[PDB]
Symmetry: C3
Subunit: 373 residues, 3 copies
């Protein structure tokens, strides 16, 4: 509380000049900026800086009154539990004039908001100008959802008669129908990982260089996850001498298709497909696709990639190629071309009948068959 009313009439003229000088200021209370020191030069009528220098005169106004004036002075305005003040020069990207609403102790930003979600445990999203509750599926991620694999043998190259539910298998190596050679390509066994193996202090088979390279790429370096694990076979495909179905990669190098799926019945869900598999180049060079065609999206170890990217030689890379095709089927779905004589290592393929996001997997996803018991 404060007053400037009353006072002898003898001095009314001083206070009357005084009140006119504010009534002139009150047109729009906008400050050009906050200052800890009175501008000693370059100020005129209409210049208002917030004199917040250390002392009792913090936040006091510092309007300079020279134009149309007898003697210019730094007229002061102590605030008192002040409130919203607009600022013109700087502004938010959304076109809002900056406002420091002085809450009485600090310069606070203006506050709004015409909607708060009811506190009843449901998440609400904006819909047609109204907030609508969301379901539980919104919060759950996709890397953990247990979707069904379409491969009967899990890519272990042991045959469908092997139980996918068992940790260990005794069946020998077996070719998979999901990987058919193309252009004369030859597929041969590359290696196998055994439970309780001897390389890490056991009595089983030993691990060959390719498997250590994979596991180091997998991050499974700890005994609990490196000395134990599920069994499976690896294979190495040698590109044939045939030169059918040519294609060029992102680097402009021509290559030919080496493997095919045998026209599997996967393109059903909106034409959507997903292929995830682990590979490494032992010799030669290869790329993905031919050129950007239709819709496509490639992730390499969780990093988006473009068509034709030449995978670095002798490194394990996680690929996830998801695209859409209403044709209902395709034989060369992978769209992978490699140079003749290239030795490509690959292990644990996984295919899905739609767009799914399991992340960087570490083992094939299970299914159910007659031998699954």
């Amino acid at each position: 509380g404060l007053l400037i009313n009353g006072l002898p009439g003898e001095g009314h003229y001083s206070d009357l000049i005084r009140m006119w000088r504010w009534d002139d200021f009150l047109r729009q209370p906008v400050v050009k900026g906050r200052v800890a020191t009175l501008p000693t030069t370059g100020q005129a009528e209409g210049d208002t800086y917030i004199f917040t220098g250390s002392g009792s005169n913090q936040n006091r106004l510092a309007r300079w009154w020279a134009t149309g004036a007898t003697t210019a002075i730094w007229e002061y305005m102590p605030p008192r539990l002040g409130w919203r003040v607009q600022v013109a020069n700087e502004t938010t990207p959304s076109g809002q004039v900056k406002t420091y609403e002085y809450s009485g102790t600090a310069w606070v930003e203006l506050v709004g908001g015409m909607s708060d979600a009811p506190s009843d445990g449901k998440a609400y999203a904006r819909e047609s100008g109204a907030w609508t509750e969301l379901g539980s599926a919104a919060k759950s991620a996709l890397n953990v959802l247990p979707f069904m694999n379409l491969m009967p043998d899990m890519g272990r190259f042991a045959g469908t008669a092997a139980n996918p539910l068992a940790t260990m298998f005794t069946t020998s190596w077996t070719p998979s129908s999901f990987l058919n050679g193309w252009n004369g390509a030859t597929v041969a066994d590359g290696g196998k990982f055994a439970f309780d193996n001897s390389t890490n202090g056991g009595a089983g088979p030993a691990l060959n260089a390719r498997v250590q390279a994979l596991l180091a790429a997998m991050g499974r370096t700890w005994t609990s996850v490196s000395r134990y694990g599920v069994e499976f076979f690896t294979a190495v495909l040698t590109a044939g001498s045939q030169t059918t179905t040519g294609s060029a990669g992102a680097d402009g190098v021509t290559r030919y298709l080496c493997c095919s799926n045998g026209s599997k019945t996967v393109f059903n869900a909106g034409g959507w497909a997903t292929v995830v598999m682990w590979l490494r180049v032992e010799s030669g060079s290869a790329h993905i696709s031919s050129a950007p065609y239709t819709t496509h999206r490639l992730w390499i170890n969780g990093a988006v990639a473009a068509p034709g990217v030449v995978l670095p030689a002798n490194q394990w890379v996680h690929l996830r190629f998801s695209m859409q095709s209403y044709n209902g089927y395709d034989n060369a779905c992978p769209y992978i071309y490699a140079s003749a004589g290239a030795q490509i290592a690959f292990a644990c393929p996984a295919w899905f009948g739609g767009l799914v996001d399991p992340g960087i997997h570490v083992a094939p996803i299970l299914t159910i068959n007659g031998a699954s018991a």
Copy 2:
């Protein structure tokens, strides 16, 4: 910057009347509306229109001062880098008085908002007055998710021994256990689509009128999707002469159930069920359900529908009937009644053990069995 202070005292009275006339206006700066021309009639004290007519006097105030006045004039107020001004007459639906905050060049709407999502790649939804991050599953749609089909033969009417993973099959027509006749209804083979068929320039079997009608309904008119595709059989069910389990449709016409599922063990997931199948009426009439009972929701080619709707005769329609039942089982789940002697064409049924949204499918969804290799 501007000033009206000073000036000889001789004329102080003019400016003093002047400042009083504003101090009267400053009670609440609300404009009745924007005008490009001064109102030549129908204005009085308290009427304030924004004179924005073309010229230098844009945005100048146009308050008319007649009540309690000697001679009324259009007193002018040039703004200068102006700011928020409230408006009373019109208002937003949410009870907010309209505000054109003049940004110095244009009349801008007031701006607020007390929450912005952190720029770290996560989507945030409002929860109990706070923004909570959402999962990846929120963004993905439902028409592409590869869920597991419950039919062993894919509705191809070829038997479970046929591989659902193959594009082509050689097994002959075979009845499906998922469609059991009711009220004496007879189910007979209707047709088959063959890969590399001869109708579109091949050497295989030809396509009969029903299959062209379906495909035209399917939108598969292009050679890539019309001259090729997966094989499957069609069947036509002729309603029997029995009159058990009567029911009336939306048009008030009584009909009887014709087919049953044989009490399949589908009602497990919260009692939820989903049936999707493609059909066409060759003769007679039929409807869906008996009357609105329990919870129910029908889509016809993506368009919601009510119970008892009489499907148009001789057109292919996509139905998706999802409901809930805690009983754990039901034989007449479809709740479809047709007139006696009606010839109903149907192809590619698909059932699911819950509420799923695959859209307008084009082929049955695959499963895995012993013959799937």
Copy 3:
């Protein structure tokens, strides 16, 4: 519209004191609070209460002017289609000074909001300071999604040769490979529920006390869901006399593992696992886990629970233990320890290869096998 301009100069001094007393008030129009009666005591200069007592003087200001005054009076300010007025003392939790914007008929809260979702049917969530559309999966819940079960026999203890798709089975009791005894534990048949049973007016087998206890726990008390249902066997595991793998519960009582899964290949999806099963304690005591280890989350009939909670004796409880393990496999996954000689009743187990939320299930989730036709 109103005016206080003009009037004879003789009385100019009264109105001039008058206008000064407002020009003093207009520094910041903040009211200390609304009052239906003028404060008869404890008021001074700067105290402004909204006199809203019943009568024509509603909303009129009640500023008391005593400091620096000749005679203090309750100066009145009728509003007219008023607008936003800030309030200092009380405030919103978000630091916003309370504002009752008088809409001319009622004291209305201030209104903002710089974003409304386009009215085109899509739900929008905030992302990096912008609203991004969400997918359909966001709205759908998780309790209804038809995910694939990993048990070949559905936990009916009838063998994999039994069809899971049929409501009724004739095969006798059969042990399940998914529940292997530990520490010498013995598993024996406990009971079976038969379709069209005689206990509820049929001709089939009768129901034993354990099954009524379960069903009453299930809420299936109605004839439609109590007199009918799917068939399955129950078993009772008697803990053995061996004392290997000790562990203590939340109450500090030591117990030993009684059953194991035989190292099933379930830990694939991000290492995520889900186990849901229905059990009741007939004798002894048991608890969950050993102590809080790694990540873990237990729901008991939809209510979250902590490790080591001793389940109440002789009550049916729904458990859902979901955890993560990158090891790829585990034999004692359940981590359940029971006292020696404890008689534990259990029925309808369900396991999943990831985090899933089917709610409180009433029957095992189906799968597909060679005998599923």
